[PDB]
Amino acid sequence: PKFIAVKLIPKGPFRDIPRADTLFGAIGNAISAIHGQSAVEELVDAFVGGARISSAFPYSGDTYYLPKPLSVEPALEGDEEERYTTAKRLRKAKYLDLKNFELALRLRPFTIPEEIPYARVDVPRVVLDSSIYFWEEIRFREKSGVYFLYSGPREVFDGYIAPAMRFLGDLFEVEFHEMKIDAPGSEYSVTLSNALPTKTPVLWRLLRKRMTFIAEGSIVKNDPGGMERLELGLSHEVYVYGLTFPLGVELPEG
């Protein structure tokens, strides 16, 4: 399908590449500060109603990266000293570029990125006994940063997502682009978002936050995921986003 890519152009280091649950968190929060809980309730309605956001992924210049579907890991058997070696780099790769992501979905041969346009950096400081602690920062290469996908009505985007994201930039600037992802029709899907599943999935990595999510790249069969309202005593009800961002995916019979 086609989507709106929200490019976060960074004005300094980030602390995390945010996944869908924290992007929804921040967006929901911003909308509360701007239009009140009335508007938070409408944002939730639009998402439950079919709207979706992905987790944030790297971009470099005009290159968009997407999560490597876990579907290809069992399929990698599709030399003797080249299979094992490449096979261990396919298993280690977190991201493919758009073109290679679309090939992986159809179980066709694809290549891995050689560079990732960011670097996780553990910065050390002595804590006066003395100990050493680390704060991780994401330094972006030049004309690089992070983007997420929006799927749904333009009026929900213009009225909630766009204004939320500018408020959130206040550190980053925001620009919007059309992105087309060619995906095969299939009973099975990849999520571009972390998700609270309603069924047991096909293939998955777990993600503990306390909440148990399946990771971006996990494979589901007709799992739309779900949101959780819950009470932490902190005035407003808090909504937790765990809806799936499905793209169709060809599986090998295993």
Partner: protein, 703 residues
Amino acid sequence: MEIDELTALGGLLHDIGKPVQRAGLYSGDHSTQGARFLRDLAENTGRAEYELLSLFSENDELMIRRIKELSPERFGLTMEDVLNALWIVYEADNLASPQASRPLYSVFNPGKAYPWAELDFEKELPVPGDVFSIRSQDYRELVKRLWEELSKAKLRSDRLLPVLEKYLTFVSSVTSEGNIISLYDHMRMTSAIALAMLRAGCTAGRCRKEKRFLLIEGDFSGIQDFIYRVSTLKYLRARSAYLELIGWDVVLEILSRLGLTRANVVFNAGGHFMIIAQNTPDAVKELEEIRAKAVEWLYREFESDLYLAIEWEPVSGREFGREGNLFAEARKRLKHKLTVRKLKRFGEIKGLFECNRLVSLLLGFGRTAKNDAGVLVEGPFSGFVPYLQGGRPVGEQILVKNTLNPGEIPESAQFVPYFVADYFKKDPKGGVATFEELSMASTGTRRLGVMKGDVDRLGEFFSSMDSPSKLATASRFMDYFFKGYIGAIIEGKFGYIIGDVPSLRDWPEEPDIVVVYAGGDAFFIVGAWDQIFELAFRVRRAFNAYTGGKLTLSVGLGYFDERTPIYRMADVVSERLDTAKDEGRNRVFVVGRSRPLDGKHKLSYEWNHYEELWRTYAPRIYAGNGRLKGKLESKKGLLWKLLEIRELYVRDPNDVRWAYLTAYLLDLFPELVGIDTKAVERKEPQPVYWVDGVLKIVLMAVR
């Protein structure tokens, strides 16, 4: 006895003839000579079972009458039960799969052979060497100690496996050239396949062409997170010890519930186990229950951190051997189910989508009920009661550390020997030394040394194994290097094998070294940075000799502020091990370095390349024991200037300024003055690029 115990013990003792024919005790071939040895042994001591077991080494009419003379009823067997045992073990011997002076040839290098010795970790390092005759006076000494030990052993597979392991690991199973299979391994896989055929309900070519066997594999995943992410060294060893017990608890559970023997364990090393079992409905139901119950327990105990992936594949006798490599092909279909299962982690818990006594981690542990006084730690099925020298052991099975000798344990107790590399530096207090005390013992800079090591392409090596007994020799020999000999290497043994290695000091009597883990094909070791640096080279050399020079390690080294949390140290050395692998294997990441990012400049060194650099440069600048040469006491500046020059080569390897500078201020480093065209044409770095690996280490030693 019972048919089970009989078929297992018979599988084991089928080939005891081989060492007696080669000791020249009874003139005949191994078959008859084996019968004679056990019959002679039965009449000695007076244990009639040895005459019943004697039948195994030998159109049935004669045997039917020999079986009747023995009166099966005396042992609670039918005549018919014994015929099956004999036919089963005979088939098991084929599926498990010429002078008599021929030694065992090395599974690592079939062109080289082992001298005759008994398995002893306290004695000399097994080194494949030149092919020698073993005298029928070495075999005669063996067969006597073998006869003395069998006279005393209770005659259960758990009291027999060890004495067969002491004495027959370094014996060729068949005296042909290029033969790789240890007799002990051939024996344990024959017992393994025998008991499985019995349990699969087959009797009197049926089980051979049918899928009557299961290959069971268990792989733990998240071991790094379970071990290295916490909140101290004590804790790290305790988690490592804990994982090994959890793994044994699951392995012995499967053996117990399927009615199998320790001989059915092909391997249990590095968080991987493989078991041969019967393919019955009862067995698959029993595995699913165990798999489900072990996963639920892991989830409750450690959350999503430590998963256990357990899979089994239906397999036929055909597939235990070649037909043009069906065994490797079967092992490949099993691996694939394990990868799928590792992408369905905790999928056996439908509920999924809705330490005070640890640190203390004596002669072993008793495997008892979870509810029992004295239980120090609990696994998914059983409690573990520490077994102390001055105390009595508790439990059905007893795990005994670093011996093949049952010791003063009760006769009803199943003997389970386990080997673990647990070397550690003893402190004035007598406790295991801390990160701080190890760092403090360093030459020059006080930093903690950390090394992570890995055999290169182990998976490849194991998949050129045709047979269970071959794989069994491969896995055991590989495991024993790490579990058995790394302690000895740390103590300073095998000096003549090891030779001159990169070194900053005289090797201490009691090294400032603590093992976190050494087993399977891997090690994680910490200590004084200069001792860890040297130990990388000692271990790589010992390992090269242990193999035939046909297998290689890669190592990641790092030198850290003693206050650096484990998780960082483990990530940095993990990254450097991965780097050494990706740059071509048989490499060491010696120290953190800068380089041109021109795709031509490797961060790690080929082991021999670093060793030649050290030989060439270290003696010209370094006296030893924290001391620069006298020449260099007032010119220590030359060393920093070379590193400053090397930085301008890193800035641009193509800009030829660095070469003008090298000529002007240098006859201590002549091979760095001229530009080396040979390197330029070969698309490789200038010698200056490599020199930091030696200089940075000397400058650390001499601060």
